[PDB]
Design a binder for these strands. Structure first.
Ligand code: ZN
Ligand code: ZN
Ligand code: ZN
Ligand code: ZN
Lengths: 1134, 114, 151, 227, 148
DNA sequence: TCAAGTACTTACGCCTGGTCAT
RNA sequence: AAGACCAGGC
DNA sequence: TGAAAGTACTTGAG
């Protein structure tokens, strides 16, 4: 019933079942579905009812209703909106949101009239594609193709004004969890903090700090090993001693405070450390005086004692650790949790608990589409209620009546969501600076791998300009959670991260069944607990909230694991961590936790039996899937902080077997260790034979490789679209490329590559391509550029019309040719367009006509592929013209293998000129042998060898990373069976002379990629063109015919050359040359009328002594700006 | 070394000097309670902090599957072959890589260093 | 080398490790372990280098000075070596363990980032992750050095 | 302005330490051609005085304190009389103080009178940059866009006109103070929009205005990015 | 730099109204040898004992003698602090510090500085700033034979 | 005179492009 | 028309 | 979540 030496098939069968059930964008899909189905309703209900007043009007929101994404065509006619229609017409793929509203009036006549407003529209929520509320949900591949949608498109993105936006997961420190750190130069020796949020129902977060005051003297009390704990409550000016905070909670005697802080009085060191904190608060000995002390340091001290006491009580009850409680009698629970925080601080100070580290991913949470949209929608709905209240208050002072339909402005929610998803600034538009930017990127459609990487991507909110290297480092906790190789090389190294293939992010759950089970399974609530029985017992935390203690932790953990395995009361998302040394059981149900499935090892055997594999092999027409495997208790989702307490086996048939004993208490096993890699790092053949920087470089490069990025690229009017002529699946593939859909949408061609030094044109990183192969279509590609244009009606008589201008009807005009336009001013497809040709002819009526036509990007030289005419949101004429250009690989284009070996094309030789084997084989690509030794991409060489074996054999080589069954010697022996030298070397003949090359050359089919970076898109030349309006200096950018910047470093270099004249040319003559007339008496510029020759200096009455001075225009601008600041930069020529 | 609380208001007691009888007293600063000291020692500070860490080790750590275990060191009390060993896992441990052994099997919980 | 590290670990566990002056017990233990592992990697590199024929192309590009060094040959053929973060062995990111696949307080070469395999042989998953951690530091240094040097 | 105020007697424009004193002679001998070090030395000498006497008059000097764009004078140890040890030191009062400092006395402070006098450091006539400094952007010729400088100048003109109209009419003597504060904010935010502890000027759409200092300050500024 | 803390094993503040009582039985043998000759004995001495035990290794590694520590304590705290050292031969090194009153009779009542907390403050000051040996700001000195 | 606070600043070179809302 | 942001390159 | 380093001002402390 076991799987010995059959494990390779079984593990990949279970992985295939996982990716068939889940996919790759399941995190985003589940997060958005939870936001729509649960979070929106909870936000609407949690909003307080609108109370206004004399009649009283009350507004209550009962239930929210979502519909399918529909478009109200101009007039309003409701209509199902397809995603392709949203992309083409620049529509927003969004669904209207209706909430039932009940309005009650109080007329003081003992009868209250309540009116129920069913299905009241409040706004449109943008719908993530292929989600539950998307129109593409449940559609077959035929249905998807019927709507011109790619079946391989994973979805998981929003369409805002045609642009596809993807929400990147935002990292944050886990809330409700006590963290103790030790700052270097701060006033606090150790600082404990707990970011507390009340079940994510309301309020962003309230952070409470419990810190110990350094080591130096505190005036008259500290004479010990480090003491004087203080607390930093929110909405309070400065520090409050912790004993005063405890006394403000109703505990006056020192014994009660200590029982809430120290759980075993037999420990003298902790009591010694806490004694001076008691000594500081010796003056305060009553609850009311402690409340007064806390209130007096508030935001604004109260006028009288009672209002200060009430303010401090409200601050402690609501804003101090709200996750513990916010209602009345929660003072005991807050005291217990604050004492727990102080206990943690003391343990860290005593050296008994290690300080928490911020890079531990168990201490991190990921804000997916769901939580981010909930955060935005909470504020938007609050603003909507605020505006409804303002409207109602304005309309109720008259006392006539009140209307709800006109009071609701759906624009607020619609525009807030659309703006935050469009611009990416997560927050209010007016507060864009306080709003986090970079969220909701534009979805990358360069390659399918690029789209998958963008849909599975995490972000660290810390600043990129920060030079701190620790958050950028690869933490150990990222194993199986985040790809170790895929990281944005550059200013985001280590900060932007990507998900592992098996990685999953928790969508969130209500911890009501867990708490009910804990009560029903004995335990002991904190209110009913005697503090004497808390040292031996184990604290039970649920979502950070300390709910009680349990005296039998082993049995409780076994029961909880059994329940989660059987999926009875505990869903698979829930994480349960037992800290045995610290006697704590932590249970987490909140969203954002990153988890991955792991097989369960009971005793020394896997729970995955041969019967599970047999059932999964027949997965079709059996209704047996990954969920059945999870429901059977074989696999388990484990997050990082639970992964702390797990004992993992890398492979079953190697680590669970009896040998020289290392570990016999294995509790879990890896499904396959190759699942640590993300989407882009899983296309690397033999990545364990490469240097890690090369794996990272290939992970970056794969998103830049060109293939067929999507199957419906014909219907897509995308700017900067690249499609490859003849994409090929790799001859050497990983077992994960099947789940990455790389065979279906590949980006690259298996190229016969010779690692040789032929003519010196492949030196450095460059490559030599076969010109004859390139002629036969090798690595040919098409470039698609879409031009959008829109007619508009802005002025009273000003308007835009698509038409073909005549020679003299338009005021403005270019020397371009308009003869290619049609009667509608649009060029028909099939028309060959060169640079400067007019794409769309548009005229502006001037309050006759003004030319606003659009021209080609310079030197494109393409052919119009498709022209689309539609109506945008405003109903105006909207045109998208796609121009295709075929780009033959030149000697400037960028190519790379799957091993970080990037390079340009040094030169192209035809078939006769290329070196040739005895069989006439000429390499398609020649790369220099010098790229290998320092960069150490042995996986490149092994890939070449395996590809040579597989092409001759007829199979597809397996290059899964850690195989232990695919060695280089085995590949060599296989190659020797096909008449080739086992090491891949082959005798080559010089193409020019026909002579044998003395050294035998390593030749074989290696998969190569054509990158987006092409010389024609990067070649620029400037010679006295456009200039900037303000600086009068050359424009910036290749697209704007701009000039290259001769920066400060270039200036320093020319100073070192002692080239004063060339420096003057670059910084004065080549850029803006200018002349001014300055006075001779003062150094200020003078009025100079050159035609009249009347030079006058206002201020000196100087008309005779005025000099001409040649200065850069930027210097005149600087001097005028200094004069604007009342500085007189008097230029003196004497 | 320890801390004694009041028997009237349950507040902390501070040592005080008896001028007449020359006897140490613990007197509450919140009320009039006093009592005679038994230990006669007020403050203890251990700079070397040489404390037997076996007192700070929980017997439940024997249930951790992530800790190594050996049969070479048997328990001193019950003579059980299996024992789980670990290092200090503590800061300010001076210079010590020594191993602390906790006996497996339920209800023994013996902890020793070797 | 692994047996020597095991012997050093046994000495440390039995308090037989005398601290070198100027170093703590953990510091002297790490010094001994790093010395053993570095000596092992140097010996393996020398053995790999002596095995190269005059026709070997790694040796051809190394002796010419065009590209590569003897350490590259050693890592390709003999042993990749120890992977370090911040000049120390791979840190205990988890509780007293580098990865969930290791038992706690495992100071042996495998747990702390010593890659016994070569690039030709291929790295084990733990070695793969530790090598990624090691190269991440170089990537960070490359991305962060430019601004400070330019300033 | 604050430093020069601390070096001179309030309502009596006269250096707290006279030029005939040997210390000022030593400072002048050491600081020929170094006006800034001369000013810092004179400030160090004059920060330790509390009475205007060697010279003339003699009245307890205030403690000048800055709170954002406002100056407050704290007259600790005042005689009696008017007292009012917490005045709002207006730019007008400081201008009248500095207008009476003699050329020799301001020369001892390092401010050469023919190049920079202390009262000129107070904005009475605000320079308006030419159209070249603040270009207008043509959008298809239908409408003309304006620079952030032009918008800030419009705000300055509006508040200045309101203040002038209220001064002519009489107003309520506190709306005058509000208008003066708003005009000070606009003038100081045109020059610099990065003062700590003050609101930033936003023309519309919640974007901070790029002041002249911001034009000149860092990389991509005038000197670094254009010269 | 070597403060008192670098060489102290443990420090305890006791209450001994009568030195001949010697609540620590290990100190009775040698404490009686010092009270045969009275420093100020009969004159009221603080009944509070600042008893400090010195680590053997940390003190032999620095060639420090308890007489040197006594001299340093006397120099740093004046004559109003009695100090007694057990012996170099004794298996554990013990230093006993008291707070001998001026005893000038008659001669600020608020300025009392209770002896129980005064001893604790003195102990903290000694452990932080005794400067038994070395130069301040010199944390650690390494000694080696250069090869370069 | 002093010295310990607290406010307050200041670090990327060049290049590409796209999108968005004024 | 030139700003913000984002992505990327070396 | 998470910068550090210098400095000029400012303030009680002598
Ligand atoms: Zn002039
Ligand atoms: Zn009491
Ligand atoms: Zn036992
Ligand atoms: Zn005067």
């Amino acid at each position: 019933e076991i799987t010995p030496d059959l494990w390779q098939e079984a593990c990949w069968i279970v992985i295939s079942s996982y990716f068939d059930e889940k996919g790759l964008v399941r995190q985003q899909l589940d997060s958005f579905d939870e936001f729509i189905q649960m979070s929106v309703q909870r936000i609407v209900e949690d909003a307080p009812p609108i109370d206004l007043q004399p009649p009283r009007y009350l507004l209550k929101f009962e239930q929210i209703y979502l519909s399918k994404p529909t478009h109200w065509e101009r007039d309003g006619a409701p209509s199902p909106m397809m995603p392709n229609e949203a992309r083409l017409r620049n529509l927003t793929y969004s669904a209207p949101l209706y909430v039932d509203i009940t309005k009650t009036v109080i007329k003081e006549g003992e009868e209250q009239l309540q009116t129920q407003h069913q299905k009241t529209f409040i706004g449109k929520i943008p719908i993530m594609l292929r989600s539950t509320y998307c129109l593409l949900n449940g559609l077959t591949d035929r249905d998807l193709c019927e709507l011109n949608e790619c079946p391989l498109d994973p979805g998981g993105y929003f369409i805002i004004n045609g642009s596809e936006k993807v929400l990147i997961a935002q990292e944050k420190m886990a809330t409700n969890t006590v963290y103790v750190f030790a700052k270097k130069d701060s006033k606090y020796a150790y600082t404990g903090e707990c970011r507390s949020c009340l079940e994510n129902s309301s309020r962003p977060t309230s952070t409470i700090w419990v810190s110990m005051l350094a080591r130096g003297g505190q005036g008259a009390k500290k004479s010990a090993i480090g003491q004087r704990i203080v607390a930093t409550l929110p909405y309070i000016k400065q520090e409050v001693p912790i004993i005063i905070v405890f006394r403000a909670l109703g505990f006056v005697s020192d014994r009660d405070i200590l029982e809430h802080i120290i759980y075993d009085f037999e420990d003298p060191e902790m009591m010694e450390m806490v004694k001076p904190s008691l000594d500081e608060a010796f003056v305060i000995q009553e609850q009311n005086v402690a409340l007064n002390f806390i209130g007096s340091r508030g935001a604004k001290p109260g006028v009288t004692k009672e209002k200060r006491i009430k303010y401090a009580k409200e601050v402690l009850q609501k804003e101090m650790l709200p996750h513990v409680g916010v209602s009345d009698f929660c003072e005991t629970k807050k005291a217990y949790f604050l004492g727990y925080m102080v206990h943690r601080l003391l343990l860290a100070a005593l050296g008994r608990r290690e300080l928490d580290d911020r890079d531990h991913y168990g201490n991190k949470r990921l804000d997916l589409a769901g939580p981010l949209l909930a955060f935005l929608f909470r504020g938007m709905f609050k603003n909507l209620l605020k505006e409804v209240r303002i409207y109602a208050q304005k309309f109720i002072d008259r006392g006539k009546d009140f209307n709800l339909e006109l009071a609701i402005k759906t624009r607020i929610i619609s525009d807030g969501l659309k703006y935050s998803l469009a611009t990416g600034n997560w927050g209010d538009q007016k507060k864009a600076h306080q709003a986090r930017a970079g969220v909701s990127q534009v979805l990358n459609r360069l390659t399918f791998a690029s789209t998958l990487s963008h849909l599975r991507r995490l972000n660290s909110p810390i600043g990129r300009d920060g030079k701190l290297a620790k958050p950028r480092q690869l933490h150990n906790t990222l194993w199986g959670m985040v790809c170790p190789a895929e990281t944005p090389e550059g200013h985001a190294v280590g900060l932007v991260k990507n998900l592992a293939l098996m990685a999953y992010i928790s969508v969130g759950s209500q911890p009501s069944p867990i708490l009910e089970f804990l009560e029903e399974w004995s335990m002991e609530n904190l209110e009913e607990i005697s503090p004497a029985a808390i040292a031996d017992a184990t604290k039970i935390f649920v979502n950070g909230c300390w709910v009680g203690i349990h005296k039998d932790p082993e049995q409780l953990m076994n029961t909880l694991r059994k329940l989660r395995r059987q999926m009875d009361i505990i869903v698979s998302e829930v994480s349960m961590i037992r800290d045995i040394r610290e006697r704590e059981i932590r249970i987490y149900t909140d969203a954002g936790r990153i988890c991955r499935p792991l097989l369960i090892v009971e005793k020394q055997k896997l729970l995955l039996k041969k019967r599970h594999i047999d059932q999964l092999k027949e997965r079709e027409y059996n209704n047996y899937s990954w969920q059945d495997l999870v429901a059977s208790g074989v696999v388990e989702y484990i997050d990082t902080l639970e992964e702390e307490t797990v004992m993992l086996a890398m492979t079953p048939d190697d680590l669970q077997e009896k040998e020289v004993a290392y570990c016999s208490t294995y509790t879990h096993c890896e499904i396959h260790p190759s699942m640590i890699l993300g989407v882009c790092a899983s296309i690397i053949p033999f990545p364990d034979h490469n240097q890690s920087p090369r794996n990272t470089y290939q992970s970056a490069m794969g998103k830049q490789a060109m293939g067929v990025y999507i199957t419906n690229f014909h219907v897509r009017m995308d700017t900067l679209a690249h499609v490859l002529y003849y994409p090929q699946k790799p001859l050497v593939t990983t077992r994960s490329m099947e789940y990455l859909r790389f065979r279906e949408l590949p980006a690259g061609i298996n190229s016969i590559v010779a690692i040789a030094s032929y003519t010196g044109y492949n030196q450095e990183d460059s490559v030599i391509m076969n010109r004859s192969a390139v002629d036969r279509g090798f690595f040919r590609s098409v470039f698609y550029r879409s031009y959008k244009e829109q007619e508009s009606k802005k002025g009273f008589d000003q308007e835009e019309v698509f038409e073909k201008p005549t020679r003299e009807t338009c005021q403005g005009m270019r020397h371009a040719i308009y003869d290619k336009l049609d009667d509608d001013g649009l060029i028909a497809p099939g028309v060959r367009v060169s640079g400067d040709d007019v794409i769309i002819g548009k005229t502006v009526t001037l309050p006759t006509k003004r030319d606003c036509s659009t021209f080609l990007r310079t030197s494109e030289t393409g052919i119009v592929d498709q022209v689309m005419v539609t109506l945008n949101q405003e109903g105006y004429k909207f045109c998208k013209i796609r121009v295709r250009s075929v780009r033959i690989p030149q000697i400037g284009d960028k190519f790379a293998s799957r091993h970080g070996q990037k390079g340009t094309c040094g030169i192209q030789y035809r078939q006769e000129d290329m070196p040739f084997t005895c069989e006439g084989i000429t390499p398609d690509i020649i790369i220099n042998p010098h790229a290998i030794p320092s960069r150490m991409t042995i996986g490149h060489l092994i890939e070449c060898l395996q590809g040579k074996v597989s092409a001759n054999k007829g199979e597809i080589g397996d290059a899964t990373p850690f195989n232990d069954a695919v060695n280089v010697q085995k590949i060599s022996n296989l190659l020797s069976d096909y008449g080739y030298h086992l090491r891949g070397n082959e005798v080559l003949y010089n193409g020019f002379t026909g002579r044998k090359i003395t050294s035998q050359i390593f030749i074989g089919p290696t998969y190569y990629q054509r990158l987006k970076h092409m010389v024609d898109d990067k070649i620029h030349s400037r010679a006295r063109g456009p200039i900037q309006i303000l600086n009068r200096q050359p424009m910036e950018g290749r697209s704007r015919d701009g000039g290259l910047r001769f920066g400060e470093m270039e200036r320093d270099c020319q100073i070192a050359h002692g080239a004063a004249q060339f420096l003057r040319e670059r910084l004065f003559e080549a850029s803006d040359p200018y002349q001014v007339h300055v006075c001779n008496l003062c150094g200020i510029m003078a009025i100079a009328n050159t035609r009249t020759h009347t030079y006058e200096c206002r201020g000196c009455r100087n008309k005779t002594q005025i000099s001409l001075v040649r200065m850069p225009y930027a210097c005149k601008l600087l001097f005028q700006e200094l004069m604007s600041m009342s500085i007189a930069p008097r230029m003196m020529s004497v | 070394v320890g801390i004694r609380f009041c028997q009237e208001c349950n507040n902390m007691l501070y040592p005080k000097e008896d001028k007449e009888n020359r006897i140490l007293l613990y007197a509450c600063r919140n009320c009039d309670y006093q009592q005679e000291a038994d230990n006669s020692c007020i403050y203890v500070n251990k700079i070397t902090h040489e404390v037997d860490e076996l007192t700070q080790i929980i017997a439940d750590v024997s249930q951790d599957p992530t800790l190594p275990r050996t049969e070479d060191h048997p328990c001193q009390k019950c003579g059980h072959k299996e024992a789980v060993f670990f290092q200090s896992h503590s800061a300010r441990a001076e210079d010590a890589m020594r191993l602390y052994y906790v006996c497996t099997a339920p209800h023994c919980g013996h902890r020793w260093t070797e | 080398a692994k047996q020597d590290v095991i012997e050093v670990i046994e000495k440390a566990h039995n308090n037989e490790l005398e601290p070198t002056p100027g170093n703590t017990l953990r510091q002297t233990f790490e010094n001994q372990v790093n010395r053993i592992l570095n000596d092992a990697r140097d010996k393996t590199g020398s053995s790999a280098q002596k095995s190269l024929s005059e026709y070997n192309n790694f040796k051809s590009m190394v002796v010419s000075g065009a590209k590569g060094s003897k350490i590259n040959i050693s890592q390709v053929i003999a042993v990749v070596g120890q992977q370090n973060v911040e000049g120390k062995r791979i840190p205990f990111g988890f509780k007293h363990r580098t990865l969930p696949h290791f038992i706690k307080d495992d100071y042996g070469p495998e747990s702390r980032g010593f890659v016994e395999n070569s690039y030709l042989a291929g790295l084990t998953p733990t070695e793969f992750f530790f090598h990624a951690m090691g190269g991440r530091e170089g990537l960070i240094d490359t991305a962060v050095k430019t601004a400070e040097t330019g300033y | 302005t604050m430093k020069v105020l601390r070096c001179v007697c309030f309502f009596c424009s006269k250096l707290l330490v006279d030029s005939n004193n040997p210390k000022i002679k030593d400072i002048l001998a050491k600081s020929k051609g170094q006006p800034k070090k001369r000013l810092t030395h004179v400030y160090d000498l004059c920060k330790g005085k509390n009475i205007c006497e060697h010279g003339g008059c003699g009245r307890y000097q205030p403690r000048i304190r800055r709170s954002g764009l406002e100056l407050y004078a704290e007259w600790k140890h005042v005689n009696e009389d008017s007292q009012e040890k917490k005045i709002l030191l207006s730019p007008e009062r400081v201008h009248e103080i500095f207008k009476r400092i003699s050329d020799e006395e301001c020369f001892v402070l390092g401010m050469e009178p023919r190049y920079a006098r202390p009262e000129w450091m107070i904005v009475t006539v605000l320079p308006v940059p030419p159209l070249s400094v603040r270009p207008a952007v043509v959008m298809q010729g239908s409408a003309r866009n304006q620079d952030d400088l032009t918008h800030k100048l419009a705000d300055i003109v509006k508040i200045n006109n309101q203040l002038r109209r209220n001064e002519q009419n009489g107003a309520a003597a506190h709306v005058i103070a509000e208008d003066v504060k708003l005009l000070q904010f606009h003038v100081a935010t045109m020059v610099d929009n990065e003062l700590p502890g003050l609101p930033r000027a936003m023309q519309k759409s919640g974007r901070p205005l790029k002041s002249l200092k911001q034009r000149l300050k860092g990389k991509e500024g005038r000197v670094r990015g254009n010269l | 730099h070597t403060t008192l803390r670098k060489v102290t094993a443990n420090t305890a503040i006791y209450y001994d109204p009568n030195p001949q009582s010697t609540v620590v039985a290990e100190d009775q043998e040698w404490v009686n040898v010092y009270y045969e000759m009275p420093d100020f004995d009969v004159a009221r001495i603080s009944p509070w004992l600042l008893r400090v035990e010195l680590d053997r290794k940390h003190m032999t590694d620095r060639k420090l003698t308890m007489e040197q520590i006594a001299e340093k304590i006397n120099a740093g705290f004046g004559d109003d602090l009695n100090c007694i050292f057990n012996d170099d031969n004794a298996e554990k090194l013990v230093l006993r510090i008291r707070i001998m009153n001026s005893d000038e009779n008659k001669m600020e009542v608020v300025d009392k500085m209770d002896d129980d907390v005064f001893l604790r403050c003195i102990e903290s000051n000694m452990l932080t700033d005794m400067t038994l040996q070395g130069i301040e700001q010199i944390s650690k000195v390494y000694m080696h034979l250069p090869q370069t």
